[PDB]
C-alpha cells in the first residue's frame, strides 16, 4: 500500500507496535492498587515490580518478581490506576 496515514494510525496499530516504534513512544507498564483481604489498606505496586513488595510491618508477601510482569499473590484484588 502507498497511502497510509502515519499521522492518524488507529489505536490497535500503536498497541501492536513495539513501545519505542510507536508515533510517540509510551510505557507498556502501569501502576495498580493491590490489597490483601485481611488488612483495610491499598498499597501501590508497579506492574513489572522486580522486588518483593510487602504489606506494612511484614504482614505477608504481596507480589513475586519474574522475567516480565510480577506474579501477584492468589487472593488479592488489584485495580490498575490511570492519570
Amino acid at each position: 500500500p502507498l497511502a497510509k496515514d502515519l499521522l492518524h494510525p488507529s489505536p490497535e496499530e500503536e498497541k501492536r507496535k513495539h513501545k519505542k516504534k510507536r508515533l510517540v513512544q509510551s510505557p507498556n507498564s502501569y501502576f495498580m492498587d493491590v490489597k490483601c483481604p485481611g488488612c483495610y489498606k491499598i498499597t501501590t505496586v508497579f506492574s513489572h515490580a522486580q522486588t518483593v513488595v510487602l504489606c506494612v510491618g511484614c504482614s505477608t508477601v504481596l507480589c513475586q518478581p519474574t522475567g516480565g510482569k510480577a506474579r501477584l499473590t492468589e487472593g488479592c484484588s488489584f485495580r490498575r490506576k490511570q492519570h
Binding site: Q25, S26, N28
Partner: protein, 149 residues
Amino acid sequence: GRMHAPGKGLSQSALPYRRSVPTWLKLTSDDVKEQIYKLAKKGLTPSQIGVILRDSHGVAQVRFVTGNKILRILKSKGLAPDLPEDLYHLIKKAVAVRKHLERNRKDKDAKFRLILIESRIHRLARYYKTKRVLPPNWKYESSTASALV
C-alpha cells in the same frame, strides 16, 4: 549495538510523554527526599533507591516529583559515594574475575573477558577525569584495585 559484543539489543525504558505527576500520588517533594536520604544511609546506590521507590511507593521518576536527580540529591546532602557507582561495579567485577583467574590459570576465556572489562574501566575512567569527578592522578592498576571496594 553492544560495545564489547556482537549483540544489537533494543530493550530499555520508555518514559511517558507527560512529565506531569499523577493525581493519586500523595507523597510530596520533601517526603521523597527524606526517604532517598534514609535508603542511601542504610547503604544503597542510586539505581537500587529508584527501584525500591517506584516498586513500593509509586514514584515513576524522582526528577518529576522533586526537581533534581537521585545522585544530585545525595551529593547535595553529602551521602554520595566517592567514585561513581558504575565504575565501582566494573572494578569489583574485574577483582572477582582476576581472583578466579589466579587459581584457574588454564582459563583462556576468563583471561580474554578480563581484558574487555579492564579496557572498559580505562575507557570510562578517563571520561570522569575530563569531567573532573576523579583526581587526574587516578590510576586503576590490578595490584591496588582489590583495595578499592
